[PDB]
Amino acid sequence: TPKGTIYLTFDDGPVNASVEVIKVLNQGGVKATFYFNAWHLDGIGDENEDRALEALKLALDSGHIVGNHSYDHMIHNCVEEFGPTSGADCNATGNHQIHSYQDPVRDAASFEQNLITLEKYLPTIRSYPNYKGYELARLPYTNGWRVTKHFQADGLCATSDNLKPWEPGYVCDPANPSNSVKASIQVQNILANQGYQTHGWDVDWAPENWGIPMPANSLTEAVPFLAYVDKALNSCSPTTIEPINSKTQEFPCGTPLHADKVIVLTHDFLFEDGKRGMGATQNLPKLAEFIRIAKEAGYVFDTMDNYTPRWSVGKTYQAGEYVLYQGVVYKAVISHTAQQDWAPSSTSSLWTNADPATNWTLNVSYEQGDIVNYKGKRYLVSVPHVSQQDWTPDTQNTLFTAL
Amino acid sequence: PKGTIYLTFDDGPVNASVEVIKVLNQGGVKATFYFNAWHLDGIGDENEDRALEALKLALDSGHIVGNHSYDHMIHNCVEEFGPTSGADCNATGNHQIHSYQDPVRDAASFEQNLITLEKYLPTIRSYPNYKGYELARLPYTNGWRVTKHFQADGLCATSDNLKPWEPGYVCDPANPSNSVKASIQVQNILANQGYQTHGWDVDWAPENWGIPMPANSLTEAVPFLAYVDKALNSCSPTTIEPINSKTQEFPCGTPLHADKVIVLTHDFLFEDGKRGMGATQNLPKLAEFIRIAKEAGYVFDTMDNYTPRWSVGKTYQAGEYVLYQGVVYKAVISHTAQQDWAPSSTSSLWTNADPATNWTLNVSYEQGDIVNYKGKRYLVSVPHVSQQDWTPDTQNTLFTALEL
Ligand SMILES: [Ca+2]
Ligand SMILES: [Ca+2]
Ligand SMILES: [Zn+2]
Ligand SMILES: [Zn+2]
């Protein structure tokens, strides 16, 4: 058995720098997950991105998983009016993490616009099974999780209503989060109701020193970075990670789905020779070496579509274990061996639906105190039970209490 | 029942939709509404200040909501799309000219529709009868993507220059307009996103568009019921007039179409306004029609049930079709359905029969089928059922890559 599983996740592509990243992954014999912002395809993301479409194609042809990071990384919330210069304008002020989320309905819509743009520039994109843009997402700035009904948590100081975390007098209060944070929580919930899973991260491969003129040069070297990964293995990193805005304060430490796994966050743009330093020259070798030594150390690499393991026939499942099947999360009812014809579903006796959603749904095991939406109204679950078609909340005033 | 009628209303939500919905409720039937969300933005050039109220009433009443595109393709009717474009296009009457152009943009209008609906009614996904992401119908076009073996296009639905009633108009199904070809591509893009699309058998419309107040001439209830009887098991999409409403290659006798009539009509025909006294004259036609159709032995259903739901305990014959969790399946063998033996991507009892073209698991592929996979096109050389190990890029005895 492997020491553990590493999930390499790259955010904020597709950009020019993405091309050589992908080749290093391919040479290293691994697959990774890229959470993309399609505004780079429109040439308005203020990066070197004329090869953005080439990069998207290469990632997909190479078998890497493509997930959804929103169309514009929420830069519409950093400027007065969104347009071709907004990316540059927001870099001018450095106000990315201030008022990052405002109208959650509009902000969640940015993930659907991302799908439109990706499918505009690459009209064949849905013929790739590794296109997961409509299944897997990650919120900008936010170490937030919607994995299963019992595995979800928010980044409670991810974004701010005024001061940045390093500025003097900055105050983070998880118990009374910022308006931006509250908005981001609603965004998570909207996406979950559209069938997305969202995942945060355990470790962030970033500059060790942002105060030099080429901060990318300071990216952690492979050996010490592997030490960070070893340290994160089974140690609830999302609660102890720094800085404070990268935390998931109420991450469910010890949750079985998270055991023996480390999600690495990094950014394509840290591997470019450019305005952040000699990223290609200094850091592509670090990536190559990290992959080699991680494997030597006993790790294997996987992608986020398998973070929740796919249901597989012949496997013996235990009561309470989670699988993913056709994009939906299910939880085993009893110990059994999966047969071909016994796949999880909305009518299975062997599984219940355990998507991290809040709209009332068939064959879900509801707990007391859960709140579900049904036909535009909210309902408290008063009697815990497994939902069925004839027990809709509008007809069941003992099991549910209207709010 | 002697048959099932599917009442379908297009081009809402508008003020006129409110009274239609109430007649349906009092008549004890559910219907399907194919909506254009631009009315919620107030730019659709109808009486539409109650648009959001109507969308809510349709949903709260249990009617099914389906996707008719954001702007009814008016962006293709004008030079630059804006708040006045519906009015501009009505001023010219060029709706059916160049109606489909860039099919990627045109299909994206269906996704934009989802965005706008979910903007004005953030709770909309909490309604099981919201089917905006599952059921669609193309503007102007009697086109169908129901199953892998039940699909056909409206070959003269739209034009590159001349309207069907104008001097010089020619329609050739064997060499369709550029607009039509683009619309065929839109159908395929939507099918690959999981949509079914459905056309219609009969269109409840003005008998005479040339008289003043043309909405008033909407067919009376009794003769309209006559039209429905005539359509029942008679392949109406091939014989219907006018020419731009035809589905020339409709698969007459296809099993899912048996004993069913889909009626198309438009909410706006039922208001008192610019098209005539539609509320006064036509709401009672709708009410009476429902009553006499039930008397004659018809029942009414919605388009989410046009492909019947998989039902536990039911016996199925090999070859029969069901809808399960939004996906069409065909039975591989006769058997009795049971709880844990539902259709799926791994079932031995069913195969996926969605009307899509991207390579998909557990599909019964036929010789000559062309599938898309990882950006390339493949011809199926021998029939087989797809499985994870048999991907087209690795199975050259099953698939042959086509040249770009
Ligand atoms: Ca999902
Ligand atoms: Ca479907
Ligand atoms: Zn990011
Ligand atoms: Zn229409």
Contact of A308 with A325, CB cutoff 8 Å: no
Residue B346 Cα to ligand 4 midpoint, Å, equals 38
- Angle (CA) A132-A135-A141 rounded to 5° is 95
- Which residues from chain B sit within 8 angstroms of residue A115, using beta carbons? 111
Closest CB to A341 among B108, B114, B341: B341
Question: Is cis: bond before B164, omega within 30 of 0?
Answer: no
* Residue range B308-404, CATH number: 2.10.10.90
Q: Are B158 and B140 in contact (CB under 8 A)?
A: yes
Of the candidates B192, B227, B264, B218, which has an alpha carbon nearest to the alpha carbon of residue B10? Answer: B264
> B122-153 in b/e burial notation, b at 16+ Cβ within 10 A?
bbbbbbbbbbbbbbbbbbbbbbbbbbbebbbb
Q: Which of B366, B339, B334, B367 is nearest to B350 (CA)?
A: B334
Ligand nearest to the CA of B69: 4
In A202-319, DSSP assigns E strands to 203-204, 261-267, 273-274, 277-278, 299-301, 316-317
Omega before residue B242 within 30° of 0, cis: yes
Helix (H, G, I), strand (E, B) or coil at B84: coil
Beta carbons of B358 and A61 less than 8 Å apart = no
CB spacing of B348 vs A340 below 8 angstroms: yes
Cα(B131)–Cα(B326) distance, integer angstroms: 9
The residue ranges of every structural domain in chain B are 1-307, 308-404
Task: Say how far apart CA A148 and CA B304 lie, in whole Å.
Answer: 28
Q: Tell me which chain B residue has its CA closest to the CA of residue A347.
A: B339
Q: How far is B64 from chain A (nearest CA, A)?
A: 12
CA B214 to chain CA centroid, Å, is 25
Nearest CA in chain A to B119: A105
CA distance A280 to A267: 12
**Domain A309-403 belongs in CATH node 1.10.8.420:** no
Question: Is the four-CA dihedral A232, A233, A238, A240 of positive or negative sign?
Answer: negative
Reported residue count of chain A is 403
Whether residue A151 contacts residue A356, with contact meaning beta carbons closer than 8 Å, is answered with yes
Query: Do B1-307 and B308-404 share a fold?
Result: no
For A357, half-sphere exposure in the C-beta direction (CA atoms, 13 angstrom radius) is 24
Assign residue B11 a region: left if phi > 0, alpha if psi is -120 to 50, beta otherwise? left
Residues in chain B within 8 Å Cβ distance of A38: none
* Best CA proximity match to B353, nearest among B256, B261, B273, B263: B256
Do the Cβ atoms of A128 and B325 come within 8 Å? Answer: no
The CATH homologous superfamily of the domain defined by A1-308:
Glycoside hydrolase/deacetylase (3.20.20.370)
Q: Cα dihedral angle (B376, B382, B383, B386), rounded to 10 degrees?
A: -40
**Interatomic CA distance for residues B82 and B86, integer angstroms:** 8
For residue B346, give the nearest of A340, A359, A374 by CB distance.
A340
Distance CA B272, CA B344 (A): 49
Which site among B344, B351, B387 would you substitute to test the A interface, given the most A Cβ atoms closer than 10 Å to its Cβ? B344
Q: Which two tokens stand for residue A186?
A: 């609603």
CB of B99 closer than 8 Å to CB of B183: yes
Residues 6 or more apart whose CB falls under 8 angstroms from that of B156 comprise B164, B171, B172, B173, B176, B177, B180, B243, B244, B246, B248
Q: How many CB atoms lie within 10 A of CB A235?
A: 13
The pair of three-digit structure tokens given for residue B231, joined into one six-digit string? 């359509």
Rounded to an integer, what distance in angstroms lies between the CA atom of residue A81 and that of residue A73? 15
Q: What are phi and psi of B352, to 5 degrees?
A: -70, 125
Cβ pairs bridging A and B (under 8 Å): 104
What string of DSSP letters covers A184-219? HHHHHHHHHHTT-EE---SEE--BS-TTSSSGGGGB
- Rounded distance between C-alpha atoms, residue B97 and residue B90, angstroms: 12
* Three-state DSSP class for residue B252: coil
Q: How far away is chain B from the Cα of A253, in angstroms, using its nearest Cα?
A: 31
Ligand 1 centroid to A400 CA: how many Å? Answer: 25
Nearest to A25 by CA among A229, A208, A294, A216: A294
Please give the resolution of this entry in Å, rounded to 1 decimal: 1.9
Interface test with B, best of A114, A127, A325 (most B CBs within 10 A): A127
The CA distance from A323 to the nearest CA of chain B, in Å, is: 15
Q: What are phi and psi of B242, to 5 degrees?
A: -80, 180
Question: How many whole angstroms separate alpha carbon B3 and alpha carbon B86?
Answer: 38
The secondary structure element, H or E, covering residue A33 is strand A33-36
Set of chain A residues whose Cβ sits within 8 Å of the Cβ of B126: 193, 359-360, 373-377
> Which tokens belong to B169?
């108009």
What is the sign, positive or negative, of the torsion defined by CA atoms of A295, A297, A298, A304? Answer: negative
- Between strands A33-36 and A4-11, the pairing is parallel
Q: Do B192 and A360 touch (CB under 8 A)?
A: no
Q: For residue B310, what is the enclosing H or E element?
A: none
d(CA B26, CA B14): 20
What is each CA distance from A346 to A29, B330, B341, in whole angstroms?
A: 37, 19, 11
Comparing CA positions, the residue from B1, B15, B192 lying closest to residue B103 is: B192
CA distance A251 to A183: 19
Q: What are phi and psi of B265, to 5 degrees?
A: -150, 180
CA distances from A219 to A25, A94, A271, A296 (A): 18, 21, 10, 22
**Running DSSP on this structure, what letter comes out for residue A387?**
-
Q: Are A154 and A185 in contact (CB under 8 A)?
A: yes
- Give SS3 for A288: helix
Distance from CA of B285 to the nearest CA of A (A): 30
Instruction: Report how far apart, in Å, the C-alpha atoms of B365 and of each of A49, B208, B357, B374, B378 are.
Output: 40, 47, 11, 18, 12
Q: Which residue of chain B has the CA closest to A341?
A: B347
Q: How far is CA A212 from CA A219, A275, A284, A296, in A?
A: 12, 12, 20, 33
Report DSSP letters for B343-370, one per residue: --TT-SSEEE--S--B--TTBEE-TT-E
CA distance, residue A335 to nearest chain B CA (Å):
15
Experimental technique of record: X-ray
Q: In which element (H, E) is residue A181 found? A: helix A179-193
Taking a 5 Å cut-off on Cβ, the residues next to ion ligand 3 are A 11-12, 140
Q: What element of type H or E holds B295? A: helix B278-296
In the block, residue with structure tokens 């859960």: A370
3-state secondary structure of A84: coil
- Distance from the Cα of B359 to chain A's closest Cα (Å) equals 7
Q: Looking at the domain B1-307, which fold is it?
A: TIM Barrel (3.20.20)
